[PDB]
Amino acid sequence: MLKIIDAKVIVTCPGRNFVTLKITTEDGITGVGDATLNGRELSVVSFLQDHMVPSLIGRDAHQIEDIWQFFYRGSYWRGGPVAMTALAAVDMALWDIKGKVAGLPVYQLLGGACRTGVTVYGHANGETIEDTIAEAVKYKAMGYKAIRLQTGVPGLASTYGVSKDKMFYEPADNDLPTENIWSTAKYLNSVPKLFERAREVLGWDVHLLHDVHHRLTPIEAARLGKDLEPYRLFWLEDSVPAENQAGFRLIRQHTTTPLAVGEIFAHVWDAKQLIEEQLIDYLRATVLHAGGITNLKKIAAFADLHHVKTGCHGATDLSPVTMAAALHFDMSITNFGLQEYMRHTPETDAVFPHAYTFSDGMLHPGDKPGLGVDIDEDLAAKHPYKRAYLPVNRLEDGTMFNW
Amino acid sequence: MLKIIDAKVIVTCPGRNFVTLKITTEDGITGVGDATLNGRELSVVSFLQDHMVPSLIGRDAHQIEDIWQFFYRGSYWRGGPVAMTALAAVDMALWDIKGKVAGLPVYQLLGGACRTGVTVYGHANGETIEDTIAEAVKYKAMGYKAIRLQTGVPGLASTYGVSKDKMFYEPADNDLPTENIWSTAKYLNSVPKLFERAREVLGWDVHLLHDVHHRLTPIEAARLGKDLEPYRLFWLEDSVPAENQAGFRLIRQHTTTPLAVGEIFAHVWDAKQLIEEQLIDYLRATVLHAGGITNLKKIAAFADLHHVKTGCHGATDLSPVTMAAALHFDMSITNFGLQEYMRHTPETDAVFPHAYTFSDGMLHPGDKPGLGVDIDEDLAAKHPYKRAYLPVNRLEDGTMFNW
Amino acid sequence: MLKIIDAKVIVTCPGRNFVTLKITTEDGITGVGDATLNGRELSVVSFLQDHMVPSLIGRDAHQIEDIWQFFYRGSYWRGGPVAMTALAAVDMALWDIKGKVAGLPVYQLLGGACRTGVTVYGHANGETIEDTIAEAVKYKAMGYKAIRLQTGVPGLASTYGVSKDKMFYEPADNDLPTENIWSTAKYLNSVPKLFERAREVLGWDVHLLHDVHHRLTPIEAARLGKDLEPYRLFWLEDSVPAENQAGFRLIRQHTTTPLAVGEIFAHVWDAKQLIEEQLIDYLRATVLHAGGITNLKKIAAFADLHHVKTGCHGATDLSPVTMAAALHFDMSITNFGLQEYMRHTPETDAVFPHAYTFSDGMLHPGDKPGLGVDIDEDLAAKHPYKRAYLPVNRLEDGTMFNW
Amino acid sequence: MLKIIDAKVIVTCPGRNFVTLKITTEDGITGVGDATLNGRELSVVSFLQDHMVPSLIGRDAHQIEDIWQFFYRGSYWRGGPVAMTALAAVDMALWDIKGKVAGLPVYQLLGGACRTGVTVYGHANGETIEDTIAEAVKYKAMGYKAIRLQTGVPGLASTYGVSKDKMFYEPADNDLPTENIWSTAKYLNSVPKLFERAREVLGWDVHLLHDVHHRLTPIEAARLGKDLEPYRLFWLEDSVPAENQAGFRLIRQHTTTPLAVGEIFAHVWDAKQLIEEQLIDYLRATVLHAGGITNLKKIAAFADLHHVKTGCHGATDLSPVTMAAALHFDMSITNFGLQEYMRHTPETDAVFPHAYTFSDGMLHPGDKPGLGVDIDEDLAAKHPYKRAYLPVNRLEDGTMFNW
Ligand SMILES: O=C(O)[C@@H](O)[C@@H](O)[C@H](O)[C@H](O)CO
Ligand SMILES: O=C(O)[C@@H](O)[C@@H](O)[C@H](O)[C@H](O)CO
Ligand SMILES: [Cl-]
Ligand SMILES: [Cl-]
Ligand SMILES: [Cl-]
Ligand SMILES: [Cl-]
Ligand SMILES: [Mg+2]
Ligand SMILES: [Mg+2]
Ligand SMILES: [Mg+2]
Ligand SMILES: [Mg+2]
16 A cells, blocks of 8 residues: 655756656655656646646555546546646656566566567758768667658758757747748658668668658558658658548558558557558557556557557657656567657756666666656756747648648 | 737636636737636646747737647647647637627628527436426426436436536536446436336427436447337437447447437547447537537538537536537537537626527527627636536446546 | 576366466576366366476566567467467466565556456356246345356256356366257247346346357347347357357347357457457456466457456366456456356365455455465375366257357 | 277377377277377377377267367367367378278268379578579479479578478477577568579479568568569468458558468468458468368368468478378369478388379379378387477567567
8 A cells, every 4th residue: 555645747948848747655655757748838737736636645556557547537528638648647657656666677567578678760860861861871870770861852941850950859949839831742752862862871771760740641641652662661650640540541552661650649549440450550659648658558459469569759858757668668568669769968868867778779778676767856946947839830822731 | 910919818716617718909809718628627728828829929810710720730739628628719719809800790600590599408307206307397397498307326326417406517516526436237227217207297399318428338328228219318418438439339220319429529530430420410519629619610511411410518617608609600500409508607607798698498699799708807806716626436346437 | 587497287186177387486486377278188288398388497487478479479389278278377377476576466566456356246057947046046145246147948958057056067077078968949938037037036236147158149149139138137148159250240230138258268369350349248258268467468458449348257167376367357457347256166275275355246366475376285286187078069969069 | 880999199200290190990990190280299199188089989980070070169168279180180080981981092082083183382492592593493303393482581590491401391400499580671671582583593384482481560561472473473471470360451452472371270260351351362271280171171162262272281290191181182172272292201201101192293192092191100119209399589679579
């Protein structure tokens, strides 16, 4: 019986915004969870502290599932990114506690080690094809086994994933949304050239990825998928907005390029049709935005029935706390595919001291009891919240579109 | 060009919590929109004032659809109760402003009057059948053409819809969520007697409704539906949790009792399969919780291709701002089914003076420019926020369940 | 790192045959897992000691999921009752060891407590209706919340569930399989009277079950299901052989009597269509015959996406080791339906001392570290293996049929 | 009335393990059946001798079908490789007896001769493409009309089907499973080159096969299928693990390369969806592992309705007894496709003297009464069981995978 005596939502910006729940049990055992929802951070803060937290006090922290259900069902209005991100943080924290009590790293509870480390991909980008490739060469020298390639679009001032940042990508860069302009035709005409060149310079053993980032229609993705088959990509991610899951039928019907989707998914329902109809090969949903370890685990199992692997989203806006948690999950399942790994700042790392390590293209969560992560509150207090928005995207005619 | 110069979020609790958005244009033309999310109110307040509101400043209030898209797509993490309720408030207020600029009630902009008024249902409930029927008799004498009936379950301390309230039902009643105990079997064995007796006393002209409130499995709903066929109910609402929309296939397959669902839906995607497969007869989604007049209008047109009518939710946690917007939408569509009408408190009515009127079993939005509703800010300020939660539900063995 | 130093298979027959696997770790921490396959026991014994066991030596007992996969995939010939029962024993014993290492009951590792106990059903049976009802009355007085009812068929020497046993049923009763004679028509014409009378005497609060035990065609099950609707059965189990899972479509299409199936299933693939098409309401698959806690947990999460609950089989040929593992799993899931509970003999209980307890219609696994169960090897050795077979069934014309 | 007076399970290892049932009738007529289940041999031994055999004694051997049903249904737990391999051996033996009594080879009972002999394929392999091709040239000179091609994968230490053995392949080569490492990307990049070269050297009249051996996902096989179309393969076998039969839809949708699957199948249910949806062109299931002559015959008939032919598995771990039986089946059906033929050792041939012969690319079962095979018990006793396991396979990251 592990009485919860305190729960606190902490907000800090050591290079970018992060929200963190910290839960303290009667005898001083603590657990932390990530609750960062990029571009909408303080909405999760309230949902937690004004609403969910008062129900945590006095409860038995052992009851992870019951607590999961109490909040998911109890809110009445169900699901959604704000609600499911709040719950992920409770869940992460509860598993962290569980691990400490058991005296085991969290993966030891979830099925134990299924591989020697978690293979990641990094983030090569450049304004030109040459730029991008040079970045990919760098990554390949650094021992990355998988690399994502993004490059500027001829005749467009900007496009997703290209900037001055090289080991990562931080698009929430302004106190109002940065405005972008877009042309599907110009992208579709040019981006295949990138992977053609990538194969010429980099060879065939390295895994290459691409994030389309919500900008195509199904018949368009189908075609990009087709143009990309000669270069044997690891996956083509978020090719089309997926609220209409049937949208992926057209793509699957026309290309064999492997498909990923789901960083934004809040619950299993966002991916069910996609999984059950075998329309994707990788699910990108994370413990952070789809309701924590408890839920992602149920989802991965459903996914394994349909040849679907995990390709968990790994952007900078997932704190080290999420990443510790993602690693314990990644380690413990059979159908793991890949883990995205964007480098945080050295200030972020200082605020969220963690046991996980990177070597030979792989992350490993380490073997500390629980998650193997904590939050330095004093250092945290040194960096207050600063408002920052994700960018937005319009068509050439001004049409409001998808960034 | 109608420049937005200010936009403020107002929180008041004249009998229960309500969140309101009030937008002001350069020329002093104002609009209001409801943003209430029962039991998770402050989270919407944050989502709006900390995140959405700053983007409103300086925009042209005329661009309703662009602003709608800007917010829906620009959030990146899409949909969900929080985001869509916040967007509803914006949408309602822009429509209000549109109305005023045009010197017309909103419904005149959306298609014109399609009926002489909007037929409502009221809520009769009680511990015993005779208590519930006694109440139904009152509502009929009051000229209601439709009545929802809820009654206690023999062998259970409490059930949905049953309490000391007669003209409404207000479960957001405690500083921590009230816990309840549920038995499906006891409920299924008893409720049909409710309606048998209802028909004996009230006869066959009055429409009789029932809200199952999330507590059945499809095969159980099938059976309850069948048991209730003899009494010709207008609808059987929320019989099963709808995240799995294919769930309704089994109900539809076994009973001709007409089906309602959707008060908690945040977007078209929560109902798409239900509508396209003709699994339901009434959609209960509202302008408040499904992204406003803009979104609900698209949804209604889609629903009409498949014999689905509107039966919008209208419990008291929808403020009179919602009700005004709901009544304009209701007036303006071919496929109107019915409108729920729970009496707000006198204090609430005073805080949100409105033009809409109730006569002869029907509401009417009235004919003022805009929505015909405002918030009295001085009066509002006399009624501070008071934290209050919806109740939760567990099975006899203690399993977390749905309320 | 928990090196496996020994792993031995133990065969004993304290009232009936049981096969047990006992794994020993370098530091003297041990675990047990049930490996009993009624009527084909020694085949599992061989599969384990001659083939699987040698691979266990020297492995890290922590790696539960890897060992699970090693054995499932490494056998080459996959699935099947033998292989999956043998793997179940391994899985149970590793979970037992995991529990002990962590100083926690297994259920604490799988999600924590979700209910205050695990509601069971007992078995009332008899030659005549009055004999069966007489027995149901006893079980109700004993505080059972659920009761299975089986009764003799007029015009048939014998039928399933009927015999001189009251608190259990043990058909593995002869050195060569007992032969029986079956008539579908006589059964279908009589059994509904069972439940009519059951309801008259026992009333409508108690859950009433029925195991058809494989003897119908879909169109026949459809009809029996319909005939039994008036009596509101908790479930109708194994109504038809399920190798053809589309068979349930016709039943589901014609009746709202809730359906159970699956005690004999060896893997997820035996139930996948049944679950995904919502053809059933309860899955009867067990940790013993479907590859253990590891597998059953994935299966349960899948079943929960489709309104399917667990109604695990629990006849006496599942040893108390199975029951301990079953109770930890049952305690830990949101979608628990019910647990079958057949009383083991006193001698059996003595051979497998256990922590689980029965009170007020509910079992509880208790709170010892691990599964909370052991085999007493000296006592076990006093009860040699005794060959015993399940009975077989033929039609009136002599056709080999299903028992 | 042919009373069975004795049934004996014989175990021997004349180069590799084989299990054999021998059944003796009252007047001295005997029949033999194969019961070898590679890597799990003694599990079938027990299932037979400890469990099934006692029910054979005293029965009428004429009753092949009733006996088939008695054991398949009678076991209660149904199907699975262990159970279905045991039953195959009973069935083979019973048909062998039947043929002797009738004084005819077994094919004469099953429909008689449908072709002049049974066309086979052999097994070319090599570390390099050159190696493999040279082996295929050899086979083509030896008069083989069909040849399977396997070759080493660049940058992998090992891969399926390559070894020092040339007229066959014996992978169960160790007293614990040999461990292998795997890379899908490296295989997919290189194996098409093999068949390109094969066509250049060998020409277009010879039939060429390839066994993928369980290592791809559907979208991957689809692609390999596509890359292989220019070389017009006879089939691409076991491209993906088939427990999810819907997995083959994606492949069929994208390639016209002919598909085979099923050596591991235990029953019709393992192939039904695959057959009924026309997802494969060849079924590889055998009399050995899918329940003997009786069952495979029913299956072939179902297969003929959907353009599916037999491509029976023929590895060394099917004894001459199985091969005699496979030939009588192959001879007697309209929809025969191909028979795999790996050479046994000369010691195996001595222990299982057989009447079947090989010439001009074809096997023929001969025209002796019954199967035309027996087992030399004295020679058999000269070679005791020796434990040997099939290999296993992990990904580069250590993930437990499919061999
Ligand atoms: O149909 C209804 O009126 C009910 O579902 C509502 O009272 C519901 O319980 C509340 O609006 C939830 O806030
Ligand atoms: O539901 C049940 O309890 C029955 O199906 C079992 O008694 C079954 O007959 C035996 O467990 C088979 O071993
Ligand atoms: Cl939300
Ligand atoms: Cl939301
Ligand atoms: Cl098996
Ligand atoms: Cl088996
Ligand atoms: Mg992305
Ligand atoms: Mg309702
Ligand atoms: Mg049963
Ligand atoms: Mg093969």
